[PDB]
Amino acid sequence: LEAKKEENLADWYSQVITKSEMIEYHDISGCYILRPWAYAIWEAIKDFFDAEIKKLGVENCYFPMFVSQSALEKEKTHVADFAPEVAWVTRSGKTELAEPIAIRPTSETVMYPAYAKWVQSHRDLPIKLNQWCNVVRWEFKHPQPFLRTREFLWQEGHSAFATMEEAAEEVLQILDLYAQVYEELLAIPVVKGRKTEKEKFAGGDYTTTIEAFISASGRAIQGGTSHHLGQNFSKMFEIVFEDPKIPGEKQFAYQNSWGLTTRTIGVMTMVHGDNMGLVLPPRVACVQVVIIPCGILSEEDKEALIAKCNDYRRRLLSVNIRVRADLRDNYSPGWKFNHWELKGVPIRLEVGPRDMKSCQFVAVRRDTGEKLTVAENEAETKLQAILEDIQVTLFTRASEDLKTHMVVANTMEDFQKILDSGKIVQIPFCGEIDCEDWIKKTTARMGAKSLCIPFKPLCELQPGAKCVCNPAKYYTLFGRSY
Amino acid sequence: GLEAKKEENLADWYSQVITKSEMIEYHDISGCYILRPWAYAIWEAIKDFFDAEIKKLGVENCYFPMFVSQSALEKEKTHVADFAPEVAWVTRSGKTELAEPIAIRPTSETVMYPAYAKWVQSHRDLPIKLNQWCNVVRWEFKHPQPFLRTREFLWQEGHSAFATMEEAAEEVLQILDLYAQVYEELLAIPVVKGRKTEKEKFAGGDYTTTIEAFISASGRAIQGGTSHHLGQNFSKMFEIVFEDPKIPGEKQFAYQNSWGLTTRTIGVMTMVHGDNMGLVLPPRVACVQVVIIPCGISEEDKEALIAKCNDYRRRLLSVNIRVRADLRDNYSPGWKFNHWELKGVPIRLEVGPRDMKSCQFVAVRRDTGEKLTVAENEAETKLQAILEDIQVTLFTRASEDLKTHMVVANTMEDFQKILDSGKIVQIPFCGEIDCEDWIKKTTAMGAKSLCIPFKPLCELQPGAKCVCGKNPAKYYTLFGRSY
Ligand SMILES: Nc1ncnc2c1ncn2[C@@H]1O[C@H](COP(=O)(O)OP(=O)(O)OP(=O)(O)O)[C@@H](O)[C@H]1O
Ligand SMILES: Nc1ncnc2c1ncn2[C@@H]1O[C@H](COP(=O)(O)OP(=O)(O)OP(=O)(O)O)[C@@H](O)[C@H]1O
Ligand SMILES: Cc1c(Br)cnc2c1ncn2CC(=O)C[C@H]1NCCC[C@@H]1O
Ligand SMILES: Cc1c(Br)cnc2c1ncn2CC(=O)C[C@H]1NCCC[C@@H]1O
Ligand SMILES: [Mg+2]
Ligand SMILES: [Mg+2]
Ligand SMILES: [Mg+2]
Ligand SMILES: [Mg+2]
Ligand SMILES: [Zn+2]
């Protein structure tokens, strides 16, 4: 690592994702290779979330990636301002297709016809389907590894209910899981909220969301989305059942949708990354402890030193710690120290010849850099403890960081001043789409958009407070954003 | 329930089975099919087993782009263009034509190997063992069929690069053996391992291994999985080179394999084990192995009946049998019988008032239809003993079905005779591409070569000639009509 995250952020991010062997660049703009080090993180997220949504009775499936032209255009499913982001297959070989086919940017236009056919009575609900898949969006904003990629991996759930009550409970549940992904797995604090009228999904009833902060940018980022669609989509797609006991009334399903993507890993990179490279939260690190042999001596002695490392590897596996023994002959220990530091492994387990005679080892934590001499017998207890402290340390630093950088303002005067200090701001807001668009352009004279209306703002709106606009309806979190 | 019959309809029987089982929903784009939870859960199981195994072998999972640049794809003939008509091209986002069209991966060699070349600059950097689970698109000319031949499908592709051929060649047979395990131990489908002849082998490789399975009801064979040794055909094309360890200034090319397996597995499972009552699931991959259905309908009475069903339910989870109690009130047991039968749940656990007071139940195995009266105390033991018998019973019958339909012929006269009986046949083959063409057209509904069996039925008697007549036989070759 040569750039420094506080001075050039773009270079520092580029250098940490590549030198950590997370990302390889591709020759299609906005597309990046996910090497095993980064993909393992995604798998951890995947393993957690998936387990959690199965408890809620969701089931995993897979729907076509191809969207016919008439299907995607059939309903008012998305505003006509998304259409330029849609990538069209137009020929196979050099043989032009009779009609062009779209690559899935989201799956409503492909599963909601299937839901319509599956729902023929109250018995057919609820429908709870989820797919892990790739998604393409020909983004016009600046593409960045894992923040905004023209192809990305994600999970979308689409659900269909007989009553609004059940729909509403799942929206908040799913949002809580996303918040758990970010806070307990990646050690990133987030702010739950509801999107404004401007920033909501146009075709739903209301959009909930988690927002994350990246101090080094001063910018927020949407970490996940959970819509309640009401019946706006069931009416479009005719997802209807007819209650026998309520003759003469159609029952349109109440629907939700929700998504989360590999953008998570980018956030983790920019929140916990330091000027020595990646910093993995133990919760998601595929290697929690790397064992490195030091001090190279007889051949039998050398084999004995390797034996001790692999003994440590076996003890640690037995207590469900993910451990790698870097026993490679071809690199020096110093080289391995730097290598696994760039990769961001939580703990390096250092063991030399005079330590195995001494019945001790060295632990170095990636976050603090503090060295520790630990008795050999107390390895499981001490290394488990240290992993739990790194996670709580990483979440604490970022929590204390988010507290610091998110403050309340009631004047656009202060709001403009605080915003330019690289902070995000909860202001009294009139909700109007115009007032939001005035704030956005005035904050450039890099404008400020709305992030979320917090479910639990910092400060309660004093009755009859006016918007910074119209009276204020709710405190709204505003800021510059990714 | 199931209206078509596998022995006469077949085509419609297959449509009726995959849909009424809730595996497949049809899509409006030709050769594209929705995987519903029931189908997907099978593929889930295969992923779980195979992913565990390749990890034991030191392979790592990753995810490479779906888009392939035109230069990277046409860079080097990593296929003959010949495969060209199968490639779907994106030419525009929204209304706006891209400067250069980009392809949707039909395989990932041209996307991954430029990365390998940059990652290899020394002896140390090998081996590379990467694998991705992903979707792939091929505009198939043949008639599309659910999971057999789809325009889009799901697979894993394992690409690996080695310093030496000894390591590479060892892996190819390991992966192939794994692939055979997916088919024979998970899906109870017997396969024959073998290598492809010159004609049917992958042009981009040195040799191709494969497992072939037989679908009797069809009279055709199907290829279940592919493991190539790429030799050094790709490393030369993408300049994946490492410095010779002994000799200054000299580089060596890497030895590569690639290998893949798709959702087609699920279709073959359906064609082999499916019957005229619908799907039949091997317990190994059956997400619901036993369904508990209550029979015989005061409210005091159902009070106790359900209680004993959920009782049966906790006991079976306690031995990690995957069990589902269908206690739904809105459905008659008869509907539920037919419902889980069509899905092919290995065992039906029936509980009525008659036998709850009897302290016993009935188990109905989906394979044989065999109903067994079971004492309640022996529920953990007996139902797992049944589960395992079901699995080996499915494989025994599918094995002996394959026994019946794969036979030896030494004359093109007999070869044509047995092939038109709806069978596949190992014949002495000279291996030349021209002979393979003539074998195809003379049987023409032509017969293609399937593999050269690693362990053929009979040893070539010394000096035996091919079935053509001009050239001597080099190897027995499994021939047949194929998908
Ligand atoms: N191009 C992208 N690359 C990676 N992740 C993305 C991308 N677009 C969206 N996401 C993530 O996917 C989740 C679901 O996306 P959704 O479509 O609901 O929002 P959106 O249109 O992406 O929003 P925005 O562009 O304001 O980020 C978002 O919460 C976001 O974290
Ligand atoms: N259209 C398809 N749908 C589903 N599975 C397929 C399809 N084409 C190939 N497969 C399977 O995917 C694997 C990938 O190997 P490969 O691409 O070399 O197949 P192939 O030689 O094109 O197959 P085939 O001649 O049977 O179509 C094969 O083992 C095959 O069983
Ligand atoms: C380019 C584009 C199109 Br075309 C259509 N709709 C789009 C879109 N970009 C964002 N959306 C909204 C969207 O995807 C809604 C939810 N889908 C289910 C998972 C969670 C998502 O939040
Ligand atoms: C349309 C097409 C092109 Br363009 C290029 N190559 C093709 C192809 N159809 C089949 N192949 C061969 C292939 O996929 C090789 C291996 N890939 C890795 C997994 C195992 C596979 O067998
Ligand atoms: Mg967007
Ligand atoms: Mg948004
Ligand atoms: Mg093919
Ligand atoms: Mg082939
Ligand atoms: Zn011949």
Short mmCIF file of N, CA and C in Angstrom, two decimals, chain B residues 430-477:
data_model
loop_
_atom_site.label_atom_id
_atom_site.label_comp_id
_atom_site.label_asym_id
_atom_site.label_seq_id
_atom_site.Cartn_x
_atom_site.Cartn_y
_atom_site.Cartn_z
N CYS B 430 -12.64 -48.14 -35.07
CA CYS B 430 -11.33 -47.68 -35.50
C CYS B 430 -11.04 -46.24 -35.09
N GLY B 431 -12.06 -45.49 -34.68
CA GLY B 431 -11.83 -44.17 -34.12
C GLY B 431 -11.71 -43.03 -35.11
N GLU B 432 -11.60 -43.32 -36.40
CA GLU B 432 -11.45 -42.27 -37.39
C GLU B 432 -12.75 -41.49 -37.55
N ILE B 433 -12.60 -40.19 -37.81
CA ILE B 433 -13.75 -39.29 -37.90
C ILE B 433 -14.64 -39.68 -39.07
N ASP B 434 -14.03 -40.12 -40.18
CA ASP B 434 -14.82 -40.54 -41.33
C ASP B 434 -15.67 -41.77 -41.00
N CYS B 435 -15.08 -42.75 -40.30
CA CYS B 435 -15.88 -43.90 -39.89
C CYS B 435 -17.02 -43.48 -38.98
N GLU B 436 -16.76 -42.55 -38.05
CA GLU B 436 -17.79 -42.10 -37.13
C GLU B 436 -18.93 -41.43 -37.89
N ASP B 437 -18.60 -40.67 -38.94
CA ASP B 437 -19.62 -40.07 -39.79
C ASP B 437 -20.47 -41.14 -40.47
N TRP B 438 -19.81 -42.13 -41.07
CA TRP B 438 -20.54 -43.20 -41.75
C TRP B 438 -21.40 -43.99 -40.77
N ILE B 439 -20.87 -44.27 -39.57
CA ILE B 439 -21.69 -44.90 -38.54
C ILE B 439 -22.91 -44.04 -38.23
N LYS B 440 -22.74 -42.72 -38.23
CA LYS B 440 -23.87 -41.83 -37.95
C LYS B 440 -24.92 -41.90 -39.05
N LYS B 441 -24.49 -41.82 -40.32
CA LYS B 441 -25.44 -41.73 -41.42
C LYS B 441 -26.07 -43.09 -41.74
N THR B 442 -25.31 -44.18 -41.62
CA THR B 442 -25.88 -45.49 -41.92
C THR B 442 -26.95 -45.86 -40.91
N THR B 443 -26.73 -45.54 -39.63
CA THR B 443 -27.78 -45.70 -38.64
C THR B 443 -28.92 -44.72 -38.86
N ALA B 444 -28.69 -43.64 -39.60
CA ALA B 444 -29.73 -42.69 -39.94
C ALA B 444 -30.54 -43.19 -41.13
N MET B 445 -32.20 -39.21 -36.49
CA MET B 445 -32.19 -40.52 -35.84
C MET B 445 -30.84 -41.21 -35.98
N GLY B 446 -29.80 -40.46 -36.34
CA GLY B 446 -28.48 -41.03 -36.44
C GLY B 446 -27.93 -41.45 -35.09
N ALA B 447 -26.95 -42.36 -35.13
CA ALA B 447 -26.26 -42.80 -33.93
C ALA B 447 -24.93 -42.07 -33.81
N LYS B 448 -24.69 -41.48 -32.64
CA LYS B 448 -23.44 -40.80 -32.32
C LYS B 448 -22.65 -41.65 -31.33
N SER B 449 -21.35 -41.37 -31.24
CA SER B 449 -20.54 -42.05 -30.24
C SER B 449 -20.72 -41.38 -28.89
N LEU B 450 -20.74 -42.18 -27.83
CA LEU B 450 -20.97 -41.65 -26.49
C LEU B 450 -19.67 -41.49 -25.72
N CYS B 451 -18.90 -42.57 -25.58
CA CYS B 451 -17.59 -42.54 -24.94
C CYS B 451 -16.85 -43.80 -25.32
N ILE B 452 -15.57 -43.84 -24.98
CA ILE B 452 -14.80 -45.09 -24.94
C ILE B 452 -14.75 -45.54 -23.48
N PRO B 453 -15.49 -46.58 -23.10
CA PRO B 453 -15.55 -46.99 -21.69
C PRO B 453 -14.18 -47.32 -21.09
N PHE B 454 -13.91 -46.75 -19.92
CA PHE B 454 -12.71 -47.11 -19.17
C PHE B 454 -12.66 -48.60 -18.89
N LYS B 455 -13.81 -49.21 -18.62
CA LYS B 455 -13.93 -50.65 -18.41
C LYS B 455 -15.05 -51.17 -19.31
N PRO B 456 -14.73 -51.51 -20.55
CA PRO B 456 -15.77 -51.99 -21.47
C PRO B 456 -16.26 -53.38 -21.09
N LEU B 457 -17.31 -53.82 -21.79
CA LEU B 457 -17.97 -55.07 -21.45
C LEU B 457 -17.08 -56.27 -21.74
N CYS B 458 -16.47 -56.29 -22.92
CA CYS B 458 -15.60 -57.39 -23.33
C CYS B 458 -14.26 -56.81 -23.76
N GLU B 459 -13.20 -57.60 -23.62
CA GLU B 459 -11.91 -57.20 -24.15
C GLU B 459 -11.86 -57.47 -25.65
N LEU B 460 -11.24 -56.54 -26.38
CA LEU B 460 -11.07 -56.71 -27.82
C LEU B 460 -10.28 -57.98 -28.13
N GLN B 461 -10.89 -58.91 -28.85
CA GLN B 461 -10.18 -60.12 -29.23
C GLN B 461 -9.08 -59.77 -30.23
N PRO B 462 -7.90 -60.37 -30.10
CA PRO B 462 -6.72 -59.84 -30.80
C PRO B 462 -6.90 -59.81 -32.31
N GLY B 463 -6.58 -58.66 -32.89
CA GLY B 463 -6.72 -58.44 -34.31
C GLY B 463 -8.13 -58.19 -34.79
N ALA B 464 -9.06 -57.89 -33.89
CA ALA B 464 -10.42 -57.60 -34.31
C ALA B 464 -10.47 -56.27 -35.05
N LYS B 465 -11.18 -56.26 -36.17
CA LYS B 465 -11.33 -55.08 -37.00
C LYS B 465 -12.55 -54.28 -36.57
N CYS B 466 -12.56 -53.01 -36.99
CA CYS B 466 -13.65 -52.09 -36.74
C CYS B 466 -14.89 -52.58 -37.47
N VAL B 467 -16.03 -51.94 -37.23
CA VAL B 467 -17.21 -52.39 -37.95
C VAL B 467 -17.24 -51.85 -39.37
N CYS B 468 -16.37 -50.90 -39.72
CA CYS B 468 -16.34 -50.44 -41.10
C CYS B 468 -15.75 -51.49 -42.03
N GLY B 469 -14.51 -51.89 -41.80
CA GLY B 469 -13.89 -52.96 -42.56
C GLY B 469 -12.50 -52.60 -43.08
N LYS B 470 -12.23 -51.30 -43.24
CA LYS B 470 -10.95 -50.89 -43.80
C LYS B 470 -9.87 -50.87 -42.72
N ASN B 471 -10.25 -50.63 -41.48
CA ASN B 471 -9.22 -50.36 -40.49
C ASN B 471 -9.43 -51.26 -39.29
N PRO B 472 -8.37 -51.58 -38.56
CA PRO B 472 -8.52 -52.45 -37.40
C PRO B 472 -9.12 -51.69 -36.23
N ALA B 473 -9.80 -52.43 -35.37
CA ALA B 473 -10.35 -51.83 -34.17
C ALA B 473 -9.22 -51.41 -33.24
N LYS B 474 -9.36 -50.22 -32.66
CA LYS B 474 -8.42 -49.76 -31.64
C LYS B 474 -9.00 -49.83 -30.24
N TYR B 475 -10.32 -49.70 -30.12
CA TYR B 475 -10.96 -49.66 -28.81
C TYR B 475 -12.44 -49.94 -28.98
N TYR B 476 -13.03 -50.59 -27.97
CA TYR B 476 -14.48 -50.68 -27.90
C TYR B 476 -15.06 -49.30 -27.65
N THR B 477 -16.16 -48.98 -28.33
CA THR B 477 -16.78 -47.67 -28.20
C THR B 477 -18.27 -47.81 -27.96
#
